[PDB]
Amino acid sequence: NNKYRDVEIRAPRGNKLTAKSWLTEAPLRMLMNNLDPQVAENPKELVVYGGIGRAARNWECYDKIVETLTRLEDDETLLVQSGKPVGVFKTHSNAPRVLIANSNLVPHWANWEHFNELDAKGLAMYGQMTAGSWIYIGSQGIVQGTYETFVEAGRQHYGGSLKGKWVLTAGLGGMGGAQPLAATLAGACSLNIESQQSRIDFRLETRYVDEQATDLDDALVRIAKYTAEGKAISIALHGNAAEILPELVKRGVRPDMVTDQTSAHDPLNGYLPAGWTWEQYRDRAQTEPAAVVKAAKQSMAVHVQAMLDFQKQGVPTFDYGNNIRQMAKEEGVADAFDFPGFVPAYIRPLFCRGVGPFRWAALSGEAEDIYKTDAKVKELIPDDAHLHRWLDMARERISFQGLPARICWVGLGLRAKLGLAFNEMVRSGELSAPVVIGRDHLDSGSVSSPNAETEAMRDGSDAVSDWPLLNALLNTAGGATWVSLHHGGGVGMGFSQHSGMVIVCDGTDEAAERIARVLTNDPGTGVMRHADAGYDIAIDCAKEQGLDLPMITG
Amino acid sequence: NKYRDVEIRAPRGNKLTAKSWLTEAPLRMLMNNLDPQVAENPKELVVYGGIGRAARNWECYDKIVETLTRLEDDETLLVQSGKPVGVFKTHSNAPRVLIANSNLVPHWANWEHFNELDAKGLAMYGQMTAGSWIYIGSQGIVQGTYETFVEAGRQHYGGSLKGKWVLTAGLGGMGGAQPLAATLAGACSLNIESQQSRIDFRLETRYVDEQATDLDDALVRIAKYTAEGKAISIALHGNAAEILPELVKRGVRPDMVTDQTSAHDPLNGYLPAGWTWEQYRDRAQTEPAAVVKAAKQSMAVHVQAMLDFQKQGVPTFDYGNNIRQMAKEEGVADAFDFPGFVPAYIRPLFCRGVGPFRWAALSGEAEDIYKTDAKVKELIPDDAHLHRWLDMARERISFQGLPARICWVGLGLRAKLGLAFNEMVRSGELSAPVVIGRDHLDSGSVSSPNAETEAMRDGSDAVSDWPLLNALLNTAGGATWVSLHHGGGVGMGFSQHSGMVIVCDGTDEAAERIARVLTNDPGTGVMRHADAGYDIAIDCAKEQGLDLPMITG
Ligand SMILES: NC(=O)c1ccc[n+]([C@@H]2O[C@H](COP(=O)([O-])OP(=O)(O)OC[C@H]3O[C@@H](n4cnc5c(N)ncnc54)[C@H](O)[C@@H]3O)[C@@H](O)[C@H]2O)c1
Ligand SMILES: NC(=O)c1ccc[n+]([C@@H]2O[C@H](COP(=O)([O-])OP(=O)(O)OC[C@H]3O[C@@H](n4cnc5c(N)ncnc54)[C@H](O)[C@@H]3O)[C@@H](O)[C@H]2O)c1
């Protein structure tokens, strides 16, 4: 192993290569970017986000991945198995250069206890979604999704804009840290409970949260003031959600929306029991992990009961993909699922058109490369004012972390248009170096997760996981530059299966042929999957886009 | 939509109905999987292994055939639990079909949830080769069953098994290979089977030799034949959960004990003690939970008899039908006191990438397989065990559907063979293309802690990254169709595994694909066993020049 190394890693910048080609330089740079101190939550331990989501299994494996990517030939493919470079095989230049499979366990053994047994033997690594597949871009990766969720909740419950309203939530980790800024962009104030001061500080440093209250009473004074003024200000409060949310219910405080984004998906590592310190928690997880898991899950039950109590008061309440309802249910809160997941409640119609967390990064390191792509997106999508406003807010309010990157939700049809245009900007020298195009594994065709993205599918097919497997096979066949299959991202061991893809735009004609089919097929599989489930909006999209769906179009 | 009173057989000869041999091949192998001489119950789409099906339902079957017929050379069909769900543009060196069957998010990966989805029209059990169109009747498993009995004989009895007998049960599609495998290894065998129609199928296909009239008759025949050193297989109509405890009580001592009933699926594949098959199938529809319970309670009695034979010193092993797990769930706490066949006997073969490599003649002509048998002997001139295998196959294995051959070979020889076969197609020595495939039971394509990855030396039994990487790499290298299945062999919850088939159509493009795919597919198994730290696998990797960064640098 070892899993601690006191080094600062950053992606190399500019146009000169360390690896043999841009197709192998790209995953090299994106692996290193996943560990950049401005990007990752705890990169000296290889941790990117999401509990113990890691970029490589241990530091020996990291070193060997870098060494191997550096020498990999253009007709060779590296296999990464739970963060370990296990084999290099001959393929061809239009296949992926890296195939990644992280954290997959045969289902009867797919649980944290067995994962932790394997980890102790040096046999495991949790990939999360984008940690082990090298496409994490800091809090920006999720911020548009969290904004779209808050906007749609506002449209359903409050007439759209959240001006004068406030969101109550918890968790200011890598992904959770997007919540305050997303709320602000949606027009709302927010109170964001976080148990570690260093995480509040990271969100302040990256300008994802605005201020820190001195205590709960002071936080409520600020929320009362800013909402009365119609300001949209995010407030962090250092504390424990499982103590504060029940206290807020006892006080009859009524937020306008309630959710949670603590790392409840991993009770041993990601969720602080009430009354404990993070330091006690980390230490006791090593001596008495069973007792720590039970204490964490008991506090999750208290926390979810508070969420249910807000909901009974008429407050819009939803689960944001961290499996907390499941944990509470296992601890006796039999009605934990009385509030819905964010996807069936708010986001699923976007997935039905293949819209999701499409993203790209400038391997050059140059901010202006992303600003030039933003301008190109506006030229190619001239009549979508919501999207133009998103890109304006991103430019004005999202500061880059590590390599400049952009989140921009778009769906089937436009993803390929954008990717081909970016490839041509690389060819012409408008862009100073190639760019990579990817996405979260949360996307319309790439995830099965019955307590998150596939909760409450109208046909009952929540648990069917053929679809992400087919998505990864098809990305490999079409020519993505690296393809990944992961288990347990988001919701934890046992609860999801999902796929990732990244494709490099290096300005070549060969890349253009791959891009045209890969960025059609990847969102196409999500429209297909939702059309199969019988969503009329997905069937309409399939017809509009000319998809060939034999059981539907013949 | 579930039942169709039709006989289906693969098209023969050289005329295509699809646009190329790469799309004609999956069309013919899908049909071959349903041939009445191949499949256990093809009018309900069932190929083998409980309810392992070739397509979800008959509408889906028809649409797969229609879609394969029109598929272009740069298009790929996606099959999702036996349903043709999308056609997408790829390129001519990608697979024409990508298949994912029966995959369920792990917390829901169980038969109860499968059956809920099935009742909604949302599910199909792919087994291993049922849903991925490379089943060749009982021949697909017979050499692995033979290699298991041979290695058990080497470990326990000095090799040959002449004078010895095996006790087992299950004469279904794959269990039907057990009698002939025992015979070829030199042993007599007693094979318990609950359905006379299954005994008849094995008799007609020459996989079992005789049927005893009752248990006493069976034992008189075993005593006589073993005393004479004959290797004869005996079927007995009955219930193993009744007969095995009776043999323990009688003090009968077989020389090996195993089982291959469909214990992996209590609702459909395992008859409770005292029930008729009709009663079981009727009640399965009326009271499924009570049927599951009764089946599992009988599996517990069955497994306790196996444990009781082992206590008497009888070599006893689990042959991958998950029966130990079912018995443990019913209270047999020491059900895993006897091992699975792979850690006990077969794993050293997997460490060299050796496994159930196979091919089929799309022409339909037996002589095409005889020509390939002769070519294998020429290419592998100094392996007399393999030559004897092919001689025994010729003599004793009858073809079922398209003529096909099982021939266990590993890393290095698979590619030599497939390139030679492709050259035979190109020269016209073979009268039509051949398909080359394998079971999903193979060194790099399955994670199954109660079967192929039981008791890995490093404790990595449940790691299922490996079959997913195998499928991704076969897709990258250009197999003709690639599959990812869940629950083959051992049932929902207990395995994940990959399949591949590649067509040898005589062309230079196929040759390029074949050379890397038939290197990489067994290469991933040698890699996986090398990663676990098996010195035999590390040696193989070095011999074969594999690039394993954490071992070779
Ligand atoms: N459905 C989705 O789309 C989706 C998307 C992204 C992330 N996720 C999930 O979101 C969750 C957060 O991800 P992340 O990257 O921010 O994780 P992280 O591990 O980086 O951060 C979790 C934060 O929760 C805080 N925390 C834990 N227990 C607390 C408690 N009791 N009170 C207050 N704070 C507490 C921790 O101090 C930490 O800062 C994870 O469960 C992740 O898997 C789900
Ligand atoms: N370990 C391996 O390498 C391996 C390989 C292949 C298949 N399998 C498993 O082998 C098993 C058999 O496969 P198959 O294709 O023969 O299945 P099948 O469903 O075609 O046949 C099962 C047979 O078991 C018989 N049977 C059921 N209960 C019985 C009982 N109590 N007494 C006697 N007979 C009984 C049935 O009548 C049937 O003929 C399945 O569990 C399959 O998944 C394991």
Ligand SMILES: O=C(O)/C=C/c1c[nH]cn1
């Ligand atoms: O946007 C990202 O990079 C990460 C997201 C993710 C989704 N679910 C768990 N992690």
Ligand SMILES: O=C(O)/C=C/c1c[nH]cn1
């Ligand atoms: O040899 C075959 O075609 C099928 C086999 C298989 C292995 N395990 C479950 N099915």
